[PDB]
Amino acid sequence: ENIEVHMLNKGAEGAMVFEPAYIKANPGDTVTFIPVDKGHNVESIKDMIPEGAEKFKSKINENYVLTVTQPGAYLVKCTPHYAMGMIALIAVGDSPANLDQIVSAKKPKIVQERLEKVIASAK
Ligand SMILES: [Cu+2]
């Protein structure tokens, strides 16, 4: 099935956000990213996607449909606003093997704080 995500300049958690920021899906599902405001895109983060999944990067302002195949956790960012915290976590299948690794990886402090919130309060 399909899960729709919006990219906004301002939302429930503050400025520059993906809503929802926690996406639960299964292999074969699609995630459709819709920039409701301009200036946003979606890009997989290096070493924060599962082992055999392909990297991806959309163009700014375009609607992008991601098909997810490999199970595991994926942290995606908005390229321009990553440093301002704009990320989302996609969890494919149950108990994603790489989730603790992604939570521990090096990333901006603001990113880390939002990630921690979404895993607690968004799961
Ligand atoms: Cu953005």
Curated annotation (Swiss-Prot):
One of its GO terms (cellular component) is periplasmic space. Residues 5-93 form the Plastocyanin-like domain. Its cofactor is Cu cation. GO terms for molecular function: copper ion binding; electron transfer activity. It comes from the Bacteria. The keyword Electron transport applies. It is found in: Periplasm. Its main location: periplasm. Induction: Under anaerobic growth conditions and by nitrite. Cu cation binds at residues 40, 78, 81, 86. Keywords: Copper, Electron transport, Metal-binding, Periplasm, Signal, Transport. Binds 1 copper ion per subunit. This soluble electron transfer copper protein is required for the inactivation of copper-containing nitrite reductase in the presence of oxygen. Serves as a direct electron donor to the nitrite reductase. This is Pseudoazurin. The chain holds residues 24 to 146 of 146 of the full protein.
